[PDB]
Structures are given as C-alpha cells and as structure tokens.
Amino acid sequence: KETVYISSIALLKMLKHGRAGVPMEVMGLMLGEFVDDYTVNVVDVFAMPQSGTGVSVEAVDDVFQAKMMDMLKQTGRDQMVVGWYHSHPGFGCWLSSVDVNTQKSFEQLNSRAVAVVVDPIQSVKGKVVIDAFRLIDLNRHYYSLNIDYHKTAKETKMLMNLHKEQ
Template sequence: MMDVETPDITEFVDNNNINAVNPATDEVYRYDAKIQEEADNSKPWRNNPTYFKRVEVSAVALMKMVTHACSGGDIEIMGMMQGKIKGDTMYVMDAFALPVEGTETRVSAQEEGYEYMVDYVEKAKKIGRHENVIGWYHSHPGYRCWLSGIDVRTQMLNQQYQDPFLAVVIDPKQTVSTGKVDIGAFRTYPENYEPSSSSSSSLTMLPTNKASDFGAHASKYYSLEISYFRSLRDAKLLERLWRNYWVKTLSQSPLVLNKQFNTDKIVEFTEKIKSTSVSRLIEKQSLSSKGSEEDGYLSKLAQESELLADDAKYGLMTNHVKHSIFNFTSAAEAGQ
C-alpha cells in the first residue's frame, strides 16, 4: 500500500494570506497587562462607534475555529476567542469551543456554556495564556457571514457589558467549497445609532430565506478588516491542527459533502433569475434609475454564476487530486 504524506500547510497559508511575523521579536505574542489596563480605563471605543477597524487572527486560532465549524456540519456551532487590543486593532490569539447545542439556524450559550468558559479561562491563565475573552465565534453553514437579528442582540449585550468584544462568523460549507476560509468579523453600533451608510449591505450567494433577516439588521453593525499571522513559536501546534484538518478534509469530497448545499445554491440561483421578469427588463430601458437598479441586480447574478462555476471546478479538481493519490498504480503493478 502506498504511504500518503500530509500535504504541506503552505497552500493553506497562501490561500488565506497568512503573514509570518518577525521571529526575532514575536511582539504580537507578548501580553502586556499594563497596556490592556490603560486601554480598558480610557475606553476610547465608547466615543467612537467604529473605533476598532481591524482584526488580526493567529493561524492557530483560525485553524481551531475552522475545524470546529466544519465538524458541526449543518448545525451551528459556537466558541469563544481569547485576545487583546492595541490601538484600533483587535488581536485574536486563541479560540476554544463551547459545549453548547445549536440548530441549523441558531446557536446560543446556556448556563453550562458560561460556566465552562470561566473555568477554561482560569485554567488557561495558569499555563501562561493571560489573554481574556475578546469575542465569540459561530458558524453559518451555507449562508455566508453576517449577523442575524439574534446575533445582533447577542453582540449588543456583549459590547454593553464586556466591551471590547468581537463577533466572528464562519461559513464552513463555503470554506470547503472554495478552499479558502469564508469568515467575517463584526461589531454592532450603539442602540439608536444611525450610520451614514451600511458596510454590510451587499452579499453574494445569500439564500433567499435569509435575505429579509440580513436586510433588516445590516445597518446595525459594521465589518472589520481581517488579516492573519503566524510564527515559528506556534509552528508545531499549527502543524498538529493542520494534520487533523487535512485528514477530515481529505476523507471527504467537497462535491459529496456539500451535495445538498450545492444543489440548494443552484436552485436559489435559478429562482433569482426567474424573478427577473421580462417586464422588469423592459422597464429599465425607459427609466434610467430603474435601469441602474436592474443593471446592478443582473451584475450580481452574473457574479454569483461565476462563483458557482468556480466552486464546481474546485470540487472536481480536488476529487482528481485525491483519485491520483489513492488510486496510484505503478507501471510495474499495472503490468502484473
């Protein structure tokens, strides 16, 4: 039997633009309690609803969250993130899963989840992980990264009582389909705050049954820019996490694993095309404002069709690679 080696993590690193930090300093990994205390005392984010602009996530935390999200399948999962802040940037250093049960549309942390979180953080500090909980993450299996009405209310409460706090959403279905982590980081605006414009107003491949919930709350939060980092300091741990993620990914075909998900996307896309009636297309020729609206809608449909095709090609290529690895037959064996 042919021995199969785990592929190098380089492809995952390249696909997600994970930057290597300076191994001579590794400053980002150092926790300065004084800096965190000063920031907490001054609370500059209270005077500026969009004070935090960026999120930097360690490769280890990213891998943990993605693996957890993928393990949930069609069920939403939830976990917490540990980290720190510096200026207008939030740093996610680590993440851990919560023992909570979710459904296909929502997940919430009950009393046992909070007890587990407190116990976990206390034990983590005993082994040198001094960062406090800086946010929560959960999955949206198959319906992209945004905040639902329940998510918005949860995040508002978190920011009210334990700010600075961050909300992260991962779509494991889209991640498996494309090979690139589909993730979003968000913070909510204060209640009754009216932003000049919504940064979350457009999202491709959003299921029709989620559109109303998305549209009703898109103006209540904003997105933060996400980047990733890694270091030799966590190389061994990252390699272990990568092997675990790779084995789970390798053992399943994206086309088979996401069969229902891919079918639903095609059905959704077909319905969107049908909704663009001939009469609406005719109207745009006489009404410039209507035409601009329709052009944008059709442009979005064209973009979605390209994404569907890319996902299918990625799945086929992945299957081909796996077939080449596991069904390899040498010339000598073929001649026997």
C-alpha cells in the same frame, strides 16, 4: 480602519470546530488583546458546548467558561475574551437578529468586543469564508472589520511540514 488579526491556531480551531458541528451552528469565545482603538489580536479560541437553545447568549455556559479560563491560565494563557465566533453552515457570514442581540450582550460587557462568523460549508481551497463585525455606535446596526493573519517565523516553518516535499 479597524483590523482583527487572527492567529494560526485561532483560525484552525474555528475551521475545525465549524466543520465538526455541521449541520449545526457552533460557537466559541475568542481570546486575545485589544492593541489599540483600531486593532484586535485574537491569539486563541475555545469551543462552547452545543446547547438546546441554539447559538445565543443562553448558549454561554458560565460554569464551562470559568473552568476553561481558569485551566488555561494555569498553562500560560491568560488573555482577555475579545469576542466570540459562530458558524453559519452554508448560509454565509452576517449577523442575524439573534446574533445582533448576542453581540449586544458582549458589547455591554466590553464595548470593543468583536463577532466573527465563519461558513464551514462554503469554505474551500483557497477560499476561507469568514468575516468580523461590530455594532454601530435608517442607519445599519453593524459593520464589517478587516481581517488579517499574524504568524511567527517559527509558526511559518511549522506549517510548511504539511506539504513538506512541496
């Protein structure tokens, strides 16, 4: 079974970004590493700008992406694009036909690529509405992967400041 591990900052950025974009869909890239055939670590993400074309391969601004990736390298983040995320405000986590086409473009660049989908409207305490997909290699076109969260001890202590009195 395949698992996408999502880091603390990755998750918070994707929820934050999705909520900021409402009522529009948003998208960004996921950074991390392919650990083995069944494991993807997503250690970070970054947002792509809203485009007129809506969320599709056309929405990927190669100039923006190259500048952002180069500037991230300069400050210690030089992880592989391991996939992309997009929001579905109010209508749940799945891939539309256009989403499948986007994901096919990501897969042609790197067959291990993952599509994460988050719903910022239906996400509430304590229900994050999120899923991760790859396309299949009558049959369905895509399938869901397990999601889990990786946090360090240092990160755990840091997060506990939010309701520190508890």
